[PDB]
Write a protein that binds this ligand. Structure first.
Ligand SMILES: Nc1ncnc2c1ncn2[C@@H]1O[C@H](CSCC[C@H](N)C(=O)O)[C@@H](O)[C@H]1O
Ligand SMILES: CCCCCCCCCC[N+](C)(C)CCCCCCCCCC
Length: 291
């Protein structure tokens, strides 16, 4: 069986909740926002992004929703409150677990609000609908068993854990297909290579970005059909800019918590990544997978 990338994932996400709070929106949503309307704030765009994803699962009350890689819980909390479903959240982060365990305790509701420190590789329960936002980029990584081949186990596992009317909303960052890349005229300056190196070393160790053709191959191989490809990477520019700005704003506060270095590293990372999505080097897509 497969082994979850615990140390690699925790090296980032367990940096400090207080820290992440300083620059993330109030719901601490940590994935590409969605500005469905020009005048939304980051916080409203995040809600819009969550809604966009959830409305595609055609959720009815009573169903059990599975959030693979639930971060700081926003999607779970939103799912219950707006669709009245039961939710199980998976994460490898200890601080996110701690944070969500407490966040759920605040408001009481009939439905189930479960958060676990369990990898998708170990999940084995029947669920109605699945949602994963910004966690997929870690799925080709593992504690010793890294490799894209992992996607195959992924789409099969969850194809078998869902009903005939099963649906999965896969939200992930993506890189251009061999062709679509040359048409964009994407170059790789020495500075770009240095940045990627910086990201894979200090920010997201083990991260791997899929091409759309990869998601198609492995998901279809399990029997899934993409009912809709919704590319929205351009939205990541406002998002990453909002995050970097918010961090600049509370710079003194942040330098207090984590020091000077950590803050320089993060600003560099937030700023650098924005241009990647603006320049079309990377994109974001929400695959609506159905049977
Ligand atoms: N193998 C694995 N199994 C389960 N969760 C994983 C994982 N690798 C990474 N993750 C989780 O995926 C998340 C990436 S951050 C995304 C958080 C959330 N979906 C949001 O949109 O705010 C983290 O919570 C991390 O713990
Ligand atoms: C090229 C190496 C890429 C490693 C990517 C690891 C991605 C982890 C994504 C995690 N979330 C969803 C929390 C988002 C973080 C902000 C966007 C970062 C985009 C980086 C693009 C690098 C090319």
């Amino acid at each position: 069986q497969l082994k979850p990338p615990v140390e690699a994932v925790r090296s980032h996400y367990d940096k400090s909740n207080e820290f992440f709070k300083l620059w993330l929106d109030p719901s601490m949503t940590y994935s590409c926002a969605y500005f469905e309307r020009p005048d939304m704030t980051l916080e409203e765009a995040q809600y819009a992004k969550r809604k966009l994803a959830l409305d595609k699962l055609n959720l009815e009350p009573g169903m059990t929703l599975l959030d693979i890689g639930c971060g700081w819980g926003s999607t779970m909390r939103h799912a219950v409150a707006e669709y009245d479903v039961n939710v199980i959240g998976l994460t490898l982060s200890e601080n996110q677990y701690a944070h969500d365990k407490a966040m759920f305790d605040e408001v009481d509701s009939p439905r189930r609000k479960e958060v676990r420190i369990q990898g998708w590789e170990e999940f084995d329960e029947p669920v109605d609908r699945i949602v994963s936002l910004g966690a997929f980029e870690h799925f080709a990584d593992g504690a010793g068993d890294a490799g894209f081949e992992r996607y195959d186990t992924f789409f099969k596992k969850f194809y078998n854990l869902t009903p005939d009317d099963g649906r999965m909303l896969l939200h992930t960052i993506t890189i251009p297909d061999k062709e679509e890349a040359q048409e964009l005229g994407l170059t790789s300056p020495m500075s770009l290579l240095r940045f990627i190196k910086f990201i894979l070393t200090e920010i997201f160790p083990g991260g791997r970005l899929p091409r759309i053709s990869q998601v198609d191959y492995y998901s279809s191989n399990a029997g899934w059909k993409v009912e809709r490809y919704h590319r929205i990477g351009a939205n990541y520019v406002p998002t990453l800019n909002a995050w970097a700005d918010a961090l600049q704003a509370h710079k003194d506060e942040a330098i207090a918590l984590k020091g000077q270095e950590t803050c320089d590293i993060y600003m560099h990372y937030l700023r650098g990544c924005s241009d990647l999505f603006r320049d079309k080097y990377t994109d974001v897509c929400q695959f609506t997978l159905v049977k």
